[PDB]
Ligand binder design. Sequence first.
Ligand SMILES: O=C(O)c1ccc(-c2nn(C(=O)c3c(Cl)cccc3C(F)(F)F)c3ccc(Cl)cc23)cc1OCc1ccccc1
Ligand SMILES: O=C(O)c1ccc(-c2nn(C(=O)c3c(Cl)cccc3C(F)(F)F)c3ccc(Cl)cc23)cc1OCc1ccccc1
Lengths: 263, 259
Amino acid sequence: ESADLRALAKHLYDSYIKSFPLTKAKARAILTGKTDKSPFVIYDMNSLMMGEDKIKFKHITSKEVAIRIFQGCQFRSVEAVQEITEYAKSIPGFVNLDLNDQVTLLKYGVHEIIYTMLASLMNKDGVLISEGQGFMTREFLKSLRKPFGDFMEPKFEFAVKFNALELDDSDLAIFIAVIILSGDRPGLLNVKPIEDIQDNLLQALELQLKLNHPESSQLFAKLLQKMTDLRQIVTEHVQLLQVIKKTETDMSLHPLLQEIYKD
Amino acid sequence: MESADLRALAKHLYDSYIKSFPLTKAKARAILTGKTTDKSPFVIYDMNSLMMGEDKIKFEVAIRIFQGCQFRSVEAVQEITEYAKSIPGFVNLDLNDQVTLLKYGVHEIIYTMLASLMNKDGVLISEGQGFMTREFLKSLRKPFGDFMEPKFEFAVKFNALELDDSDLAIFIAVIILSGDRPGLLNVKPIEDIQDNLLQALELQLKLNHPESSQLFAKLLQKMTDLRQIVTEHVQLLQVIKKTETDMSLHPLLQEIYKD
Ligand SMILES: O=C(O)c1ccc(-c2nn(C(=O)c3c(Cl)cccc3C(F)(F)F)c3ccc(Cl)cc23)cc1OCc1ccccc1
Ligand SMILES: O=C(O)c1ccc(-c2nn(C(=O)c3c(Cl)cccc3C(F)(F)F)c3ccc(Cl)cc23)cc1OCc1ccccc1
């Protein structure tokens, strides 16, 4: 079944490339400076104002900067959820699961996958925006006022550690599939076929990492250990959103917009 | 990194685990499953049978049981510390990192090893001479009842893997040698030791559970559930501290929980 796992790896890679707008391979070329197309840099309040007049960043509807950026992260996350939902359908076996378990697996997986894939857009100095056309500095995000500064920095701290593994897109395509097919999500009705699919994906990821990183000792194990850190930081993440809700009375969104963002 | 060396490391760790921990999973399972006259535990299921139990096993009620667990936890810390010293390379690490690895490792290991003493109905106590029912523990008053039950929820799931003692010996070693503990000074020599231990665990699980697909991955995923439950534990212990001044902690546990 060696050729079967490679077929599964290639299938997921092809789908991952079609599902997501900015791949890791492309994002790294932008971040490192390796075919022109130099991104607009947002490093302070003035260059943010000019950036939405030039890039027209899809986040301009509160007048306060820190809130507008925070809500920007929400808008992009809602888009990522739909992209991840579309990608999940290409995982062999997923659409044949009970419909409620599909919803459940997506509901509890999307946060871990967004964190994971956000690392692809990050280095220690900042993050790509607008499909790589802009670059927002870490220092500017970290220095946002009151809770917002400390809301952004944990994402960078995770990404820097996760990126030391040096996964590429063909590695990440299987890893993301493994996260989705987690048989311990609360409320699953039929755990057995989810775990059976995840076992196939784990075999595929194990073989992929040996062939693509033959010199990287116990990388498979190290990546599974990261699925630990993910459960933890997603939990911290949610407890940070709750504090913003109870503290900040300037989060006035139209009730309909609030409904779009409810998750 | 080569097979005979990985098998040699597995045998070393199992041999040392048997020397360090007096009540193995193999012994606990023989006691739990029964059909043996000689190894039958006295069963504590209510207040009256607890009273008779201290006359037989020589083992406020909720406090006395909590205090019972602390005493055994301190002994467990001692046993785990002794085992850690046998892990090749551990004592050669920077002394501050040895402390750090134990500080954050003992709790995850106690939980792991407590599963060996448990089934869905209760837990062995007093080196297997007693068995305290889950329902009795769960029904202890105020915060103490809900303090015991998460251990059982984990053990039922962990025990579904059907690991034996030779498996757990390497798994416990992998937990201790975690390079992501806060405050470590030299991550690299710890990660090199864990890499050998992970190679050793991977091969051990393939040879000992050849029909158990991706058991390695499933066991590493369990180190997730451990990290979470240790967190819930300390958050419950903190609430007990604010309510109960009629109890103190052993200085060893006290230092372990500081930060
Ligand atoms: O383009 C992308 O793929 C992209 C995806 C996510 C983010 C982003 N989310 N986020 C979350 O707090 C989050 C996560 Cl992690 C998970 C679930 C839900 C949320 C949220 F709460 F938002 F609903 C961030 C926090 C800090 C920074 Cl730095 C970026 C993000 C950004 C993306 O693209 C880069 C970007 C950066 C700023 C604004 C817009 C886009
Ligand atoms: O014999 C053993 O090896 C053994 C070890 C641990 C426990 C046990 N600890 N505990 C902790 O709340 C704990 C932990 Cl996990 C870690 C650190 C500190 C503490 C504490 F809070 F105490 F400071 C429990 C909670 C519920 C149950 Cl069910 C058992 C335990 C029991 C052991 O043996 C079985 C046993 C059970 C009751 C009494 C005596 C012995």
